[PDB]
């Protein structure tokens, strides 16, 4: 009473809160992270990187890993940092420029560019930690 | 080619989204039973307003009692197609809640009252009998043409 | 360790179905006015039911109009701790149904009525003002006990 | 009118049509399907082995491929099938016949239990696709 009526929180009520938790859920994918292998070590074992979304969604967290992580990564313990609302684009494919030059690997690579002209480039392990990347990249901007 | 993680945003999403869409809608093709407005002695004083199934047409008809049974789209004698809605207004800017004479409405249905205006010059000018089929109406108004 | 392709059926579905059920419940919190059952002349006509916020106890109370603003949950005299609920009856099956002298309801009614048995002995009566007080009721009752 | 109220079309209607929803992308995973790696070829290349649901969602069908698949591999072409009817049971890790003896294997490995004392066992490429194949089984059974 004595005006208003439930018959609206279909549209005004239901629909944001499954789009916002649909929304946190492909952030919370990134806050989770990725650990991504140094193809270009040339040390005598395997090394790693990962990379993450700090738990309040400001900042990824990324850096070099001794080895590949069984559990969590705590963000603040790696190395480098880039603030979410420094990101200019991402950019996927052809179109990254460590990808100027191949069919598999294209579908995997993508690079955030930042700054001035920086780029943050990547080549996921798979097809799901790369749609994970890009879709989450999607919802943080 | 291309990964299950994307379901929920590429997929689920707006499938739930259509869901809720259709819904909204499917609810005035259900359809209302609405007072007659302006009725003359011995006229019928209700008429009944519903969306066709495929959502392309208000269909709408006197009737002489609200209906115990379903009333069929086709039995109703009035079309207005949908794509000749121009917009909806509501409360006092309504022109059956302008009438000044003998034709104006009690203030206590201020809260009640939409019109459909088509063909720029037109109006189906509704008073809801209670909030929540205004609800329908209104909200189902704005999936079938804004949102 | 563990995939993210398991939360459409480990995250997203609880959670929806979370949503609703809060949603369904809620509108209980928001409550109802209702008609003041065997009023005597000069008593309160109205009274006004609503859920805690933490959906644990149903408060009421006599009013003696229909309330424009929020009836705050504390205002209410009495409870009714929903731990205490039996089973919810309605139509032909509740007692203020089954009166047989001056008490008697209009068959009219028989579709918006409902009880909810508590404590062995005892009912809240209710005949909903409308089809879609009654739902509210009866649905949202239904969420907060079985479903 | 004359009964009923669309406040009840959130329970009646949108809840049990938002889990058809999901339970219809679950087993669309598996209709989809998943290459898997023959681990014991000693053939001069890779060789592959493909598993996917059928549309109808009623039979298993599976087969050694020459290559891996960059597109739809059609059912019918593969050589074996399973009806779904036939299965008596998933299991997973260390209750798997073929990981009786290694915790990232047994965290990939599941079998499927049909007929007399039959099974299909498997070693999931990925935690995503052996996430895909329990999940979806779940869906089916």
Chains 1, 4 share one sequence.
């Not at 040339?42 to 990324?62: E, G, T």
Request: with cysteine.
């Amino acid at each position: 009473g004595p005006l208003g009526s439930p018959i609206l929180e279909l549209k005004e009520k239901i629909q944001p809160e499954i789009l916002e938790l649909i929304k946190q859920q492909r952030l919370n994918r990134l806050v989770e992270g990725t650990c991504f292998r140094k193809l270009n070590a040339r040390r005598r074992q395997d090394k790693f990187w990962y990379c993450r979304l700090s738990p309040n969604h400001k900042v990824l967290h990324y850096g070099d890993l001794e080895e590949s992580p069984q559990g969590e990564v705590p963000h603040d313990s790696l190395q480098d940092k880039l603030p979410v609302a420094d990101i200019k684009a991402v950019v996927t494919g052809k179109d990254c420029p460590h990808m100027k030059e191949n069919k598999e690997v294209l579908e995997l690579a993508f690079s955030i560019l930042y700054d001035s002209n920086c780029q943050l480039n990547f080549i996921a392990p798979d097809k799901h930690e790369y749609c994970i990347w890009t879709d989450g990249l999607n919802a943080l901007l």
